[PDB]
RNA sequence: CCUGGACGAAGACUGACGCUCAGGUGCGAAAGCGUGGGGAGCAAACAGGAUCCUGGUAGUCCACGCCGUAAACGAUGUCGACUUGGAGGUUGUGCCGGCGUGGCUUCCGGAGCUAACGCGUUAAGUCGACCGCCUGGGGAGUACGGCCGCAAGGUUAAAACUCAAAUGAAUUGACGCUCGUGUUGUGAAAUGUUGGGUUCCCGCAACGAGCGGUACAAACCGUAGGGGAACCUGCGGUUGG
RNA sequence: GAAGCACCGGCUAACUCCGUGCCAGCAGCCGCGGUAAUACGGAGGGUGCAAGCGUUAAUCGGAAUUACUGGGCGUAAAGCGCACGCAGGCGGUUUGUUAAGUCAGAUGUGAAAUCCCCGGGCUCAACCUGGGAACUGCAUCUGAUACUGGCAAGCUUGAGU
């Protein structure tokens, strides 16, 4: 139900940095990010309209660690909701509990944050939630339970979050190891390079 | 045999408009004048004149804006073979409101826009755009 | 400055007494994304040569299309020799939902949200011509307010 | 700018036979006598004066005017009136692609300037039984064809055409580039191809001079300032 | 001798009495059949002579009955209205050979239409009314059943199975040479380099440059017959030669 | 104590080597194999999914490919050989009321569940659930009557004498 293979292979195939590692080292220092994985990765072949759409869909899935069945349900909910389909799709993805943990800087990586959630170390509104896909509503306070405040993973992840750009739709309190989900992020609040209309067109077909 | 005079009225308009005609003349009738009045109010034509009593003939003045026909698409929707009646909430919007739909309501002949304001359905005489 | 896309490449052939002579034909579409789009049909013997010819033809012979913030003013029907093309304005966030040939034309023209369908023959050169024909005859609310004697308020607000 | 009676003397009212009549020219025909259409001189004067007024406006703002005349009489007539207004002309056969193939036409001009240079300044003094005579034949043919556009070096801002039906090729090239077209449209021509239509007879030699004289003088008047 | 339809001029008169039509009814080339005549020429079959020719039966003709099929075609159902124009034929009629006004008809051609060809006021343009008919090729308009017929057969009309094509139009070739640009065509492509004269000139949608019948990738339709049948013949029709 | 399956000629995301040599085989279509096969079998690598993954069957979609919305009939399949004509379909132009079609409003009904909207409860989801909307319908009543039809007079352009 997860991907347990090499992380940098996914980033190399997509050509960009998927933030699958904590970022202590530069991405090019650990792999040839400009070259695709495999024997024939040095060559750069053509890519059709379906290829770029599939690559964009695989990009966001591998960013948030979501398989196809779970991701497809997100598209149906996004297309069912009011307003923009692509913006809702990113908002639904960004609202995942593990994503909120990673964005608030409790886990160095979303995969690490996924493990933190699964091991019953994340308390949402005083309630232990270990479901990675569990959605976080605005004005909800997530926190590290006192039993998990002795782990060095939480302490180390705070420094990495400080170096990274701090989201404007979230509130972080590293002293208390708790955060507040202020609001749903907008399209501008996220990375512009990600394309959502390609995903919408791909899932329409 | 001429089994639809209303469609013939539209055909004369469409043929004359495409042939860069100055005016189109046709036999007149009570319904034709009502239709021609609606077109003039919306500005799809300039003016209509009715001449004669024993054998009335309707005269229509066509409109050209910039070397081009103003009436680009005039279509007979309801026909004697297949009558078309729509309710107020089913009234079509031609070109998302840019065009008009001549609707025969119980209070007379008007456009689809007026019919929605008056809350009246009826027979869709033609589409004008 | 303006976006350009290659749609189709085909290998054509002619017969001479010596033998068969081959060539490559490339269909491209260009546009600025702000309501201007043109299509070009290059014809050479080498594929890189043909695509450059198509871009040169497409760069000129452009048309101007009114766009309502990335969508069509009203649903329209584009018709060419064999292809029937139906295009329809869509809400914000729907994206370009059209065929392979139609999608390229609408992207370079600046159309972002649109519902489109192709009927009849789907030959790429005929489809793009119908799409170009279907967009050039589309009239903005100002244009219909110009032909008729009413202002924009009377056309739509009334 | 020309009285109706004067145009009658010039033969502007005269037209072709009704057998070859163009239906598009119906509004511009007064009638038909002796199986010959008569051009309504009343319509011509306001159209010609407005066409002349537009020529004054575009010349004064430093445009460029090209004259196209290939008729037997009009060929020489246009050239005499062309230099008076200091504008460009095409007396001989209009070569297909003069406007469309401007890049190719430019190379023909570049050939001509080098060709005249050797015979005027270069002083080649080389015959070889082949080179000199062929170059002179090249010079004489190039001068007849592109002699009137040597000083232009660019796309003409507007065109003046005689016998628009005979010069349809030039009109088609101008319509592709958006260049306004002025033409003397006879009864058998196509008026839809011209922007400013001048319903006059293009076959009468005296009429052509009246057209050219009234046009060339206005260009000088507009360019005088 | 009897009789139908059409058209024109000028009125009178009736006052929507109209249009289209499933079933139905009648009509319906040639061939073929029934009954009785007729039979010159021509001529399936047949007989004989040759490597087509001679002879000649049905049939072709007539009266009546049947058959109801054709490439029965303009491969375009009928009715109505509207929409640029030229040339001609054929019949009216009005006015002073001219000058208009009708009906039918032939060619050319604009917009428009069409995949192209092409159609183009007699539309395959623009609309309306109604009817008929089609939705892969072959099997097959065949089998079975019904109906009709003296028979030939006609009409209505499948399925199994098989193939992934069959087909239309147009193009390029077969049976000194190219490019660039431009132009025509949806396109393949053409123009250039299609013509006249003598490599050259001129004309020229080209301008310049670099170089040296095909079912290919007479035919057919309906019908009738064959014992010198590698298919052929009689009759009428079609050009899809 | 816990990762497999299919695919990598095009359509269709992902390629090399080896063996084989129109053999063995592959195959939804186009089609691959007779000596360098990215199409066979194996390996390496890669891609697509994932406690599933392929294949087969069936329906719908794509198929505007039975086209009501939304197709055709000169030559691609398609105008009956032609005509008359019953039933049928449709029908010029004025008034008068008829209010059947149609139109507007009201009333009754259209079971619950389901679908959709807004919330709620299961740590999330599936699932469960509150309230709506919808249920495109039918019937009765009251109106409007421009159009269509019925009825009664006409009118003359259609059609006829
Ligand atoms: Mg699962
Ligand atoms: Mg949405
Ligand atoms: Mg869909
Ligand atoms: Mg209709
Ligand atoms: Mg092909
Ligand atoms: Mg198709
Ligand atoms: Mg095809
Ligand atoms: Mg193709
Ligand atoms: Mg008689
Ligand atoms: Mg009477
Ligand atoms: Mg009377
Ligand atoms: Mg019948
Ligand atoms: Mg008979
Ligand atoms: Mg008979
Ligand atoms: Mg007989
Ligand atoms: Mg007999
Ligand atoms: Mg006998
Ligand atoms: Mg005999
Ligand atoms: Mg003997
Ligand atoms: Mg014989
Ligand atoms: Mg005999
Ligand atoms: Mg004999
Ligand atoms: Mg015999
Ligand atoms: Mg006998
Ligand atoms: Mg019979
Ligand atoms: Mg038949
Ligand atoms: Mg015939
Ligand atoms: Mg037939
Ligand atoms: Mg007609
Ligand atoms: Mg023709
Ligand atoms: Mg057709
Ligand atoms: Mg079949
Ligand atoms: Mg049979
Ligand atoms: Mg019987
Ligand atoms: Mg029997
Ligand atoms: Mg039988
Ligand atoms: Mg039978
Ligand atoms: Mg062609
Ligand atoms: Mg072209
Ligand atoms: Mg064409
Ligand atoms: Mg032939
Ligand atoms: Mg036969
Ligand atoms: Mg014969
Ligand atoms: Mg015949
Ligand atoms: Mg055929
Ligand atoms: Mg690929
Ligand atoms: Mg080997
Ligand atoms: Mg090998
Ligand atoms: Mg191979
Ligand atoms: Mg495969
Ligand atoms: Mg293999
Ligand atoms: Mg592997
Ligand atoms: Mg794998
Ligand atoms: Mg399981
Ligand atoms: Mg299916
Ligand atoms: Mg369907
Ligand atoms: Mg239909
Ligand atoms: Mg069809
Ligand atoms: Mg056929
Ligand atoms: Mg027929
Ligand atoms: Mg039939
Ligand atoms: Mg029959
Ligand atoms: Mg039949
Ligand atoms: Mg009849
Ligand atoms: Mg009847
Ligand atoms: Mg009736
Ligand atoms: Mg009526
Ligand atoms: Mg009434
Ligand atoms: Mg009622
Ligand atoms: Mg009532
Ligand atoms: Mg009601
Ligand atoms: Mg209710
Ligand atoms: Mg549903
Ligand atoms: Mg709950
Ligand atoms: Mg909940
Ligand atoms: Mg519920
Ligand atoms: Mg409830
Ligand atoms: Mg309710
Ligand atoms: Mg219910
Ligand atoms: Mg009332
Ligand atoms: Mg009534
Ligand atoms: Mg009534």
Curated annotation (Swiss-Prot), chain C:
GO terms for biological process: translation. Keywords: Ribonucleoprotein, Ribosomal protein, RNA-binding, rRNA-binding. One of its GO terms (molecular function) is rRNA binding. GO terms for cellular component: small ribosomal subunit. Residues 2-65 form the S5 DRBM domain. The keyword rRNA-binding applies. It comes from the Bacteria. PROSITE patterns: RIBOSOMAL_S5 (PS00585), S5_DSRBD (PS50881). InterPro entries: Ribosomal_Su5_D2-typ_SF (IPR020568), Ribosomal_uS5 (IPR000851), Ribosomal_uS5_bac-type (IPR005712), Ribosomal_uS5_C (IPR005324), Ribosomal_uS5_N (IPR013810), Ribosomal_uS5_N_CS (IPR018192), Ribsml_uS5_D2-typ_fold_subgr (IPR014721). With S4 and S12 plays an important role in translational accuracy. Located at the back of the 30S subunit body where it stabilizes the conformation of the head with respect to the body. Part of the 30S ribosomal subunit. Contacts proteins S4 and S8. The N-terminal domain interacts with the head of the 30S subunit; the C-terminal domain interacts with the body and contacts protein S4. The interaction surface between S4 and S5 is involved in control of translational fidelity. NCBIfam families: rpsE_bact. HAMAP family: Ribosomal_uS5_B. This is Small ribosomal subunit protein uS5. It comes from Escherichia coli O1:K1 / APEC. The gene is rpsE.
């Amino acid at each position: 139900a997860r991907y347990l293979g090499p992380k940098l292979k996914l980033s190399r195939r997509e050509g960009t940095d998927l933030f699958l590692k904590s970022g202590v080292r530069a991405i090019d220092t650990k792999c040839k990010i400009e070259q695709a994985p495999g024997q024939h990765g040095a060559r750069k072949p053509r890519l059709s309209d379906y290829g770029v759409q599939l690559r964009e869909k695989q990009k966001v899935r591998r960013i948030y660690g979501v398989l196809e069945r779970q991701f497809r349900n997100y598209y149906k909910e996004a297309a069912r909701l009011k307003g923009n389909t692509g913006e809702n799709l990113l908002a639904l993805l960004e609202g995942r509990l593990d994503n909120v943990v990673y964005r608030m800087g409790f886990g160095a990586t979303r995969a690490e944050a996924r493990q933190l959630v699964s091991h019953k170390a994340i308390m949402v509104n005083g309630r232990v939630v270990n479901i990675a896909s569990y959605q976080v509503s605005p004005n909800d306070v997530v926190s590290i339970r006192e039993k998990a405040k002795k782990q060095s993973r939480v302490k180390a992840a705070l420094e990495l979050a400080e170096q990274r750009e701090k989201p404007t739709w979230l509130e972080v309190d590293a002293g208390k190891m708790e955060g507040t989900f202020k609001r749903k992020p907008e399209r501008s609040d996220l990375s512009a390079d990600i394309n959502e209309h390609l995903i919408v067109e791909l899932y329409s077909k | 045999s001429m089994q639809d005079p209303i469609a013939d009225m539209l055909t004369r308009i469409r043929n004359g408009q495409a042939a860069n005609k100055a005016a189109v003349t046709m036999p007149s009738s009570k319904l034709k004048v009502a239709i021609a009045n609606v077109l003039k109010e919306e500005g799809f034509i300039e003016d209509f004149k009715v001449e004669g009593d024993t054998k009335p003939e309707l005269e229509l003045t066509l409109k050209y804006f910039q070397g081009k026909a103003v009436v680009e698409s005039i279509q007979r929707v309801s026909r004697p073979g297949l009558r078309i009646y729509k309710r107020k909430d089913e009234l079509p919007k031609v070109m998302a409101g840019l065009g008009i739909a001549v609707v025969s309501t119980s209070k007379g002949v008007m456009t689809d826009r007026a019919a929605r304001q008056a809350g009246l359905g009826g027979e869709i005489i033609c589409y004008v755009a | 400055e303006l976006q350009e896309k290659l749609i189709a490449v085909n290998r054509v052939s002619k017969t001479v007494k010596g033998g068969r002579i081959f060539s490559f034909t490339a269909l491209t579409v260009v546009g600025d994304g702000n309501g201007r789009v043109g299509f070009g049909y290059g014809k050479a013997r080498e594929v890189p040569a043909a695509i450059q010819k198509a871009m040169e033809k497409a760069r000129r012979n452009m048309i101007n299309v009114a766009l309502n913030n990335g969508t069509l003013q009203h649903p329209v029907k584009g018709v060419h020799t064999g292809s029937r093309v139906f295009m329809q304005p869509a809400s914000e966030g729907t994206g370009i939902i059209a065929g392979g040939a139609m999608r390229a034309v609408l992207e370079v023209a600046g159309v972002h949200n649109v519902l489109a369908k192709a009927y009849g023959s789907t030959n790429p050169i005929n489809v793009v011509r119908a799409t170009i024909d279907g967009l050039e005859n589309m009239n903005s609310p100002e244009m219909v307010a110009a032909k008729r004697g009413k202002s924009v308020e009377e056309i739509l607000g009334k | 700018t020309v009285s109706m009676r004067d145009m009658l003397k010039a033969g502007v009212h005269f037209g072709h036979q009704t057998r070859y009549w163009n239906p598009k020219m119906k509004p511009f025909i007064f009638g038909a006598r002796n199986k010959v259409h008569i051009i309504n001189l009343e319509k011509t004067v306001p159209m010609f004066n407005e066409a002349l007024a537009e020529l004054n406006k575009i010349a004064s703002r430093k445009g460029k005017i090209l004259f196209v005349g290939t008729k037997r009489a009009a060929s020489e007539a246009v050239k005499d009136a062309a230099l008076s207004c200091d504008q460009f002309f095409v007396n001989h056969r209009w070569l297909g692609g003069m406007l469309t193939n401007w890049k190719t036409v430019r190379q023909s001009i570049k050939r001509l300037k080098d060709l005249e240079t050797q015979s005027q300044d270069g002083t080649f003094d080389k015959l070889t039984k082949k080179e000199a005579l062929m170059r002179t034949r090249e010079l004489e043919k190039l001068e007849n064809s592109l002699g009137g556009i040597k000083d232009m070096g660019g796309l003409p801002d507007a065109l003046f055409v005689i016998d628009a039906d005979h010069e349809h090729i030039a009109i088609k090239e101008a319509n592709n580039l958006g260049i306004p077209v002025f033409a003397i449209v006879d009864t058998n021509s196509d008026p839809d191809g011209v922007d400013f239509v001048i319903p006059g007879n293009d076959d009468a030699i005296r009429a052509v001079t009246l057209y050219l004289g009234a046009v060339a003088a206005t260009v000088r008047e507009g360019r005088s300032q």
